[PDB]
Amino acid sequence: GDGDTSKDDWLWYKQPASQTDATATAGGNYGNPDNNRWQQTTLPFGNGKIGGTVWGEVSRERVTFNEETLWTGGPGSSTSYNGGNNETKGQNGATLRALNKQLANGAETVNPGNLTGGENAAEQGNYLNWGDIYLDYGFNDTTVTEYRRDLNLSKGKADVTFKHDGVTYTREYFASNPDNVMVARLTASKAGKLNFNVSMPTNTNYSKTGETTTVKGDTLTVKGALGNNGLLYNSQIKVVLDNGEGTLSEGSDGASLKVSDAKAVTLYIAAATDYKQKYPSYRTGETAAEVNTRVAKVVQDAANKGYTAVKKAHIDDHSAIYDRVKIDLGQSGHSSDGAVATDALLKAYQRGSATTAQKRELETLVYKYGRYLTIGSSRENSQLPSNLQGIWSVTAGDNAHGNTPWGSDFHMNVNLQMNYWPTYSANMGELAEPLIEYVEGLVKPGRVTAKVYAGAETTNPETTPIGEGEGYMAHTENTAYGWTAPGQSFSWGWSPAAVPWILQNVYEAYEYSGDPALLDRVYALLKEESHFYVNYMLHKAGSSSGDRLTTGVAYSPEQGPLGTDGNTYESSLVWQMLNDAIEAAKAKGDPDGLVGNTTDCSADNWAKNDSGNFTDANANRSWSCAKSLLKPIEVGDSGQIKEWYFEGALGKKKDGSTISGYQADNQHRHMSHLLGLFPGDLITIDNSEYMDAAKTSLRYRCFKGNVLQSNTGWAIGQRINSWARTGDGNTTYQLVELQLKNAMYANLFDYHAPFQIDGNFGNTSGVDEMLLQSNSTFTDTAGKKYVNYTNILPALPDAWAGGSVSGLVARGNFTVGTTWKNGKATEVRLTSNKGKQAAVKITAGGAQNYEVKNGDTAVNAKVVTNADGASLLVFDTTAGTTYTITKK
Ligand SMILES: [Ca+2]
């Protein structure tokens, strides 16, 4: 039994998916109404590896099915797979070198069009919908009463119930991480009334070799190999009748199992491929028989444990993570008097008829869903991080840019980053593990790309540890198979700062934990990528970009000239990487002596000969020196953050002429030059000069006249987080409102359109950043610095006058709870998990007005103040202790 579910968080609906509103914009690849219905109406669950999306149909029930490693492309997709790298284009770095020389000699722009790769869509591949589980009850009439379908976010399961011709039928679905198995629990209220056919057809749109569907005893097996690349796949459904009551027989089609005259059944569903994240073969080495044996043991082991035990272990595991964070903004819920279904709730929110409690319900549900979706798509033992769709998809085809939008891939120039923005602050740090492994997984294939396009060759690349090579390069479109080449067209295909950027998400695993094992891993990654940038990528700018190091030829997605002499986007990212790398080094005592200093530090130190080697072997090219020479931020003549170093007024060059390709209405969708504001620490509340300029930049991008503009997907996700960092909670909240009104389907999937999970994760992160920030550095008037200080309620919306949150995490590894009333903090609970010095700003109240206690015991806390009158409480902590901060 479920017991008391009154306090659980539910998405819920009074009708099946087929009857649920799917009228929002469908987007590319969703012209088929059935596929569009899937993305707008079905309810997801997963264990980080396998996933389902539940339709809740009355008679022909459907659970769309996924496994995270079902990927076309990679080795075996051609006779020459090499991660997309094109030697003729790269010329071992010569192409890039010559373009940079043109810029260094004074060109304002160049044509970087030859910097491409990745031409074969069959080699690139994409993520596939595996297929579907169908449970066909064979009802003559679909007419029912007492229908409900729900997703219980608290217990990590989907439910369906209805009454048909006097009989109540129930369904429950979950995917257990501990037991690595999907469970469907099916009941009828009257004995003999549970009758259904179970099948598991693979998606009919990808090519296959040697697929069979067979029944033996209580188990249905579908197995074969992908036609595109020979990847082996195997799924099994084991049907277990309660008390042996009922009859189990082979379906008349020979491709299904028939349950007759039963009352209750448990289905155990498992699936696997022979994928392995192992360069260059990307296979386990198992035979089809071995995969089959492995999957069979999963379902048998689960059945042996039994439904009650498997369910208990699942709910314990799921809730252990899910229940870490609680948030109370005054929301209604499914147990409230006059509770409204989630689709009805969304509609009311859109129409402006939702009550305050209902608005808070939708806002907190969407927030919580981002956490839920992390648990479902990204577990410690996932083989791959969440992709553009987490793990959930209905579309499939063999080739990239085919039947599935953007291949449901790893899009590493904002999207994958966004997937891992709430992971730490929302107390799910362990769930970043597959991202860390993925980025480690880019090193071997990326060393090939680094050699081809930048001339950075690692000798003995197989045995040279991460950190000790010459560099690894990867771009926007990535896959399960080390597709680290740039894409076929420069504008969208080339973006080597994607690696620096994703390294930010990786380094945050250390920032938020203080875990020395993570420190070693992130340091190794940062060491080699910093080596790569310092030695191969950076150059002294030509006259168009002033006196600084830049990253050479660069595009600012997705406006302006194709190739300028660096830009704010790339310089902000490289600056942040070197900053993180220096911090990682310092935390280890700089054993490699790479931090250096700014003594005899000049962009002239980067001088190279015709072959691309430094002419001065002994010049200072240390991380500190390189970082100091980027000068990534310049405020322009419109008080804006410059996007290009040749910029004067907004969208203009210093001579007043047009920046060709700049979107003249100032409302370009990308804000690539603001990554230093979010996620970075280049532009923070502690630097008014830069922050005022960033706010000006944001206003031009986000407003048409005086009206704040809606956006969708990654763009709205980015804007929410960016505005949160400014401290303007009202504008930030207004963007959350716009996301909910204009970028959420009935099942609360974020849309671009089509469905893109990035914005779901971006929402959760954005709410976190409104309530807690921990990325900035405070400087008191005596000059003392407090790095990564805990900032309570930095961008609290006036719309949320009172509330509480518990279980957020701040950098330095502090768990944070806060309660507020009339727009001001009444309590902060700060749990020090690692014993680091506490430094606490209370934006909504002023920390100087508060005092710190350990239970009843007064804690010595110094008040420090900066030049603008902002204060911190500074105090020692001990790991394991919670400190309570209240008004004096
Ligand atoms: Ca996954």
Domain CATH code at residue 292: 2.70.98.50
Report the CATH number that the domain containing residue 814 is assigned in CATH.
2.60.40.1180
Helix (H) or strand (E) holding 883: strand 881-887
**By C-alpha distance, which of 718, 719, 721, 724 is closest to 709?**
719
Query: Could you give the residue ranges of the DSSP H alpha helices within 323-465?
Result: 342-351, 356-377, 415-419, 433-441, 443-454
- Judge if 296 and 370 occupy the same domain: no
Q: Report how many domains make up the chain.
A: 3
Write out the two tokens for 767.
């709410």
C-alpha–C-alpha distance, residues 228 and 224, integer Å = 12
CB 222 within 8 A of CB 254: no
C-alpha–C-alpha distance, residues 245 and 863, integer Å = 71
> What separation in Å is there between the alpha carbon of 126 and the centre of ligand 1?
14
CB 345 within 8 A of CB 352: no
C-alpha–C-alpha distance, residues 522 and 757, integer Å = 26
Residue type, 420: Y
CA distances from 179 to 268, 384, 391 (A): 10, 18, 18
- The dihedrals phi and psi of 198, each to the nearest 5 degrees, come to -110, 130
**By C-alpha distance, which of 844, 833, 827, 842 is closest to 874?**
842
- The dihedrals phi and psi of 116, each to the nearest 5 degrees, come to -140, 170
- Judge if 404 and 522 occupy the same domain: yes
> What separation in Å is there between the alpha carbon of 392 and the centre of ligand 1?
10
C-alpha–C-alpha distance, residues 107 and 631, integer Å = 20
> What separation in Å is there between the alpha carbon of 492 and the centre of ligand 1?
25
C-alpha–C-alpha distance, residues 598 and 596, integer Å = 7
CA distances from 737 to 367, 797, 839 (A): 12, 12, 32
> What separation in Å is there between the alpha carbon of 28 and the centre of ligand 1?
24
> What separation in Å is there between the alpha carbon of 502 and the centre of ligand 1?
17
DSSP one-letter code for 14: S
The rounded Cα 516 to chain-centroid distance in angstroms is 24
> What separation in Å is there between the alpha carbon of 839 and the centre of ligand 1?
36
> What separation in Å is there between the alpha carbon of 276 and the centre of ligand 1?
13
- Judge if 428 and 496 occupy the same domain: yes
**By C-alpha distance, which of 404, 438, 403, 474 is closest to 117?**
474
Write out the two tokens for 291.
């995969």
By the 10 Å C-beta count (0-12 exposed, 13-18 middle, 19+ buried), 79 is classed as exposed
> What separation in Å is there between the alpha carbon of 117 and the centre of ligand 1?
27
Q: How many residues does the chain have?
A: 888
> What separation in Å is there between the alpha carbon of 835 and the centre of ligand 1?
33
> What separation in Å is there between the alpha carbon of 411 and the centre of ligand 1?
14
Write out the two tokens for 634.
């310049």
> What separation in Å is there between the alpha carbon of 270 and the centre of ligand 1?
15
C-alpha–C-alpha distance, residues 480 and 295, integer Å = 21
DSSP one-letter code for 18: G
- Judge if 785 and 859 occupy the same domain: yes
> What separation in Å is there between the alpha carbon of 385 and the centre of ligand 1?
5
Q: At a CB cut-off of 8 Å and minimum separation 6, what does 835 contact?
A: 877, 878, 879
> What separation in Å is there between the alpha carbon of 192 and the centre of ligand 1?
39
> What separation in Å is there between the alpha carbon of 419 and the centre of ligand 1?
11
> What separation in Å is there between the alpha carbon of 627 and the centre of ligand 1?
35
- Judge if 261 and 366 occupy the same domain: no
CB 437 within 8 A of CB 505: no
Report the CATH number that the domain containing residue 733 is assigned in CATH.
1.50.10.10
Write out the two tokens for 603.
């962009």
C-alpha–C-alpha distance, residues 841 and 845, integer Å = 9
- Judge if 634 and 740 occupy the same domain: yes
Residues in binding site: 68, 377, 384, 511, 681
Q: Which residue has the tokens 């995969």?
A: 291
- Judge if 643 and 720 occupy the same domain: yes
CA distances from 803 to 425, 632, 774, 796 (A): 18, 39, 20, 10
C-alpha–C-alpha distance, residues 879 and 344, integer Å = 46
Residue type, 339: A
Write out the two tokens for 860.
């010595």
> What separation in Å is there between the alpha carbon of 245 and the centre of ligand 1?
37
> What separation in Å is there between the alpha carbon of 435 and the centre of ligand 1?
9
> What separation in Å is there between the alpha carbon of 297 and the centre of ligand 1?
22
Query: How would DSSP label each residue in 131-196?
Result: EEEEEE---S----EEEEEEEETTTTEEEEEEEETTEEEEEEEEEETTTTEEEEEEEESSTT-EEE
Q: At a CB cut-off of 8 Å and minimum separation 6, what does 528 contact?
A: 443, 466, 467, 468, 469, 470, 471, 472
- Judge if 95 and 157 occupy the same domain: no
Q: Which residue has the tokens 């954005």?
A: 766
Q: Which residue has the tokens 């706010």?
A: 695
> What separation in Å is there between the alpha carbon of 393 and the centre of ligand 1?
12
- Judge if 50 and 109 occupy the same domain: no
DSSP one-letter code for 653: B
> What separation in Å is there between the alpha carbon of 102 and the centre of ligand 1?
43
Of the three residues 271, 303, 323, the one that is the final residue of a domain is 323
Write out the two tokens for 764.
């959760």
User: Across-strand partners of 778?
Assistant: 786
C-alpha–C-alpha distance, residues 129 and 866, integer Å = 55
> What separation in Å is there between the alpha carbon of 209 and the centre of ligand 1?
25
Of the three residues 771, 803, 835, the one that is the final residue of a domain is 771
C-alpha–C-alpha distance, residues 190 and 261, integer Å = 10
- Judge if 284 and 339 occupy the same domain: no
Secondary structure of residue 259 in the 3-state scheme: strand
Q: At a CB cut-off of 8 Å and minimum separation 6, what does 143 contact?
A: 164
> What separation in Å is there between the alpha carbon of 408 and the centre of ligand 1?
12
Secondary structure of residue 859 in the 3-state scheme: coil
Q: At a CB cut-off of 8 Å and minimum separation 6, what does 232 contact?
A: 223, 224, 225, 273, 274, 286, 288, 291
Query: Could you give the residue ranges of the DSSP H alpha helices within 163-287?
Result: none
> What separation in Å is there between the alpha carbon of 378 and the centre of ligand 1?
5
- Judge if 378 and 469 occupy the same domain: yes
- Judge if 11 and 107 occupy the same domain: no
Query: How would DSSP label each residue in 22-60?
Result: --S---TT--SHHHHHHHHH-EEEESSSEEEEE---SSE
Secondary structure of residue 104 in the 3-state scheme: helix
* Neighbouring C-beta atoms of residue 607, cutoff 10 Å: 13
> What separation in Å is there between the alpha carbon of 262 and the centre of ligand 1?
35
C-alpha–C-alpha distance, residues 392 and 394, integer Å = 7
Domain coverage including residue 885: 324-332+772-888
Of the three residues 771, 795, 814, the one that is the final residue of a domain is 771
User: Across-strand partners of 257?
Assistant: 198, 250
> What separation in Å is there between the alpha carbon of 860 and the centre of ligand 1?
46
Secondary structure of residue 576 in the 3-state scheme: helix
> What separation in Å is there between the alpha carbon of 391 and the centre of ligand 1?
6
Residues in binding site for Ca(2+): 68, 377, 384, 511, 681
**By C-alpha distance, which of 368, 301, 313 is closest to 153?**
368
> What separation in Å is there between the alpha carbon of 537 and the centre of ligand 1?
32
Experimental structure resolution, Å: 1.1
C-alpha–C-alpha distance, residues 444 and 282, integer Å = 12
> What separation in Å is there between the alpha carbon of 176 and the centre of ligand 1?
14
